[PDB]
Amino acid sequence: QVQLVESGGGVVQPGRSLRLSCEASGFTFSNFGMHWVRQTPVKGLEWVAIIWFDGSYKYYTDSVKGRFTISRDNSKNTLYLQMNSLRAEDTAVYYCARARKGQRSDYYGSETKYTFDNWGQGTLVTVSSASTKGPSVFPLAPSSKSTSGGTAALGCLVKDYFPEPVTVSWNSGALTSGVHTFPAVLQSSGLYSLSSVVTVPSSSLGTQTYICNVNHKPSNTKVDKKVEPK
Amino acid sequence: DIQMTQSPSTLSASVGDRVTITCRASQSINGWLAWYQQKPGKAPKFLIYKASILESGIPSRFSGSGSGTEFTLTISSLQPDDFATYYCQQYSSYWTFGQGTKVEIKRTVAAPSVFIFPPSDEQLKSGTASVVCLLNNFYPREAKVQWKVDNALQSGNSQESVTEQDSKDSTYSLSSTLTLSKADYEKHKVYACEVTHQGLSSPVTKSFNRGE
Amino acid sequence: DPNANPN
């Protein structure tokens, strides 16, 4: 199927350089135009740039002109966004999208406008002068004080990481029902902390294995933690 | 540029209710209006193009219409998984979005499942002690959490975080964490978490003693 | 034209 994957996000010192890479699979990357979109927490969704299928033409939004450069390597199925002279306004989640005809494929008219679909998950760029700190994963073990009814709650505590974000899966993605990954909180030290919990059958606490998988891509931290009853 | 304006910014409605969102354009964009849906933790999803053409695989309960500069997204029967923020985009002159409209879901009152977690030995060996209190699947979102260490109401040492509304049971979860030093944690015995909610007949107290 | 066929 069509899958776009972004990479390259983290901290950048205000007024520095960063490159993003969008990998493409499931279609002919050299046949479609590509977009870079970003979402800011307050100002919302904002188009950034578009590149043609062959890289012949490139158009940018005004705020990024003279600072960003969209490019592509059709032999590698990889889209690029070279972000230079980064500002505070550039802190956002950057998606890459594939060009899409804003009308059914059979349609043929004078004015046929195009948009973008097939958005990837995104890569979060945080513009800050602070240092990257990896997370610390601790187990929220189930106990009699975590059991109500036939249900037992467990989880893992991820604290003291910067920048955002961390992704937390359970049993390598095979456990999704009952999972509650909470939004991160800003600790008094400027570092982030979150907790991901999951409710499971209490009777299966001895025959089942629950491992919390934490991924902090900015610090290249991959932690796998087993939560056992005590 | 072309400015898109959505209304309202937040909408509450029950399951099986008809929901309509309006989208204004600063000028005539012909029929080049697209609707995106962003569910929590996921990227926006292509829903409608040409203001009315649903994307392949979009449920039949979604629909769209437009009259030159004003466009609407309509859900005939609102569903739990329809909880999201919906954006309208014009692709006539460049690509610009609206501020979005979050369609929250009104359900019945649900009492929280309260769980408490003593700090871990791995964390305690590092110098801190985080006591975690969990409020699982409750409605409404408003909830009261108080920390009581040896029956002493704590202040200035806890942090909270609520999850977005669930896409299945349309409930909320809350994470209250009481952070202490290993010293202060060993200067007491009883660590409690008292919860107050509409669906709780009386306040529910979950507690543990240091060293159980 | 930015909104024409880029493919």
CATH number where B89 lies: 2.60.40.10
Contact A7, A68 (CB under 8 A): no
- Is A136-226 in the same CATH topology as A3-127? yes
State the residue for tokens 């926006």. Answer: B44
Contact A21, A29 (CB under 8 A): no
Alpha-carbon distance of B176 to B114, in angstroms, equals 11
Alpha-carbon distance of A31 to A55, in angstroms, equals 11
DSSP B82: G
Q: How many Cβ pairs within 8 Å bridge chains A and B?
A: 139
Cross-strand partners of B116: B133
Alpha-carbon distance of B109 to B140, in angstroms, equals 6
CA geometry: angle B33, B72, B65, nearest 5 deg: 70
Residues 80-119 (B) with a CB less than 8 A from some CB of A: 87, 89, 91-92, 94-100, 113-119
| Cα–Cα nearest to A146, from A65, A84, A73, A230 | A230
Q: Which of B57, B77, B105 is the last residue of a domain?
A: B105
Query: Which structure tokens are listed for A129?
Result: 């002068």
Q: Which of B54, B73, B105 is the last residue of a domain?
A: B105
Q: How many domains does chain B have?
A: 2
**b/e string for B176-207 if b means 16 or more Cβ within 10 A?**
bbbbbeeeebeeeeebbbbbebeebeeebebe
H-type alpha helices, B40-147: 121-124
**CA-derived radius of gyration, chain A:** 21
Residue A155's SS3 state is strand
Cross-strand partners of B62: B75
Query: Nearest-CA residue of chain B relative to A165?
Result: B41
What residues in A contact B164, CB-CB < 8 Å? 183
| Cα–Cα nearest to A162, from A194, A209, A197 | A194
CA geometry: angle B181, B186, B191, nearest 5 deg: 90
Residue B121's SS3 state is helix
- Whether the CB of B96 is below 8 Å from some CB of chain C: the reply is no
CA dihedral A65, A7, A77, A97 (to 10 degrees): -60
Q: Are residues B99 and B142 in the same domain?
A: no
| Cα–Cα nearest to A201, from A127, A155, A134, A148 | A148
Topology (CATH) of A136-226: Immunoglobulin-like (2.60.40)
Domain segments of chain A as ranges: 3-127, 136-226
Alpha-carbon distance C1 to nearest alpha carbon in chain A (angstroms): 10
Q: Are residues B93 and B184 in the same domain?
A: no
Residues 1-7 (C) with a CB less than 8 A from some CB of A: 2-7
Alpha-carbon distance of A112 to A105, in angstroms, equals 11
Q: Which of B82, B105, B128 is the last residue of a domain?
A: B105
CB pair distance less than 8 Å for C7 and A112:
no
Cross-strand partners of A198: A154, A179
CB pair distance less than 8 Å for B32 and C2:
no
Q: Are residues B164 and B134 in the same domain?
A: yes
State the residue for tokens 């998984």. Answer: B81
Q: Are residues B131 and B92 in the same domain?
A: no
Alpha-carbon distance B61 to nearest alpha carbon in chain C (angstroms): 30
Alpha-carbon distance of B26 to B69, in angstroms, equals 7
Resolution (A): 2.9
- Whether the CB of B95 is below 8 Å from some CB of chain C: the reply is yes
- Whether the CB of A65 is below 8 Å from some CB of chain C: the reply is no
- Kindly list the distances between the CA atom of residue A199 and the CA atoms of B55, B89, B137, B197, in Å, as whole numbers in the listed order: 35, 39, 11, 21
Q: Are residues B22 and B77 in the same domain?
A: yes
Cross-strand partners of A39: A45, A93
Q: Are residues B61 and B33 in the same domain?
A: yes
Select the residue of A100, A187, A197 nearest B134 (Cβ to Cβ): A197
The superfamily (CATH) of domain A3-127 is Immunoglobulins (2.60.40.10)
Contact B47, B35 (CB under 8 A): yes
Find which of A145, A177, A191, A205 to mutate to test the B interface (most B CBs within 10 Å of its CB).
A145
State the residue for tokens 């699982």. Answer: B136
What residues in B contact A95, CB-CB < 8 Å? 43-44
Segments forming the whole domain that contains residue B156: 113-209
Helical (H) or strand (E) element with A29: none
Alpha-carbon distance A226 to nearest alpha carbon in chain C (angstroms): 48
Phi-psi region of A190 (alpha: psi -120 to 50; beta: other; left: phi over 0): left
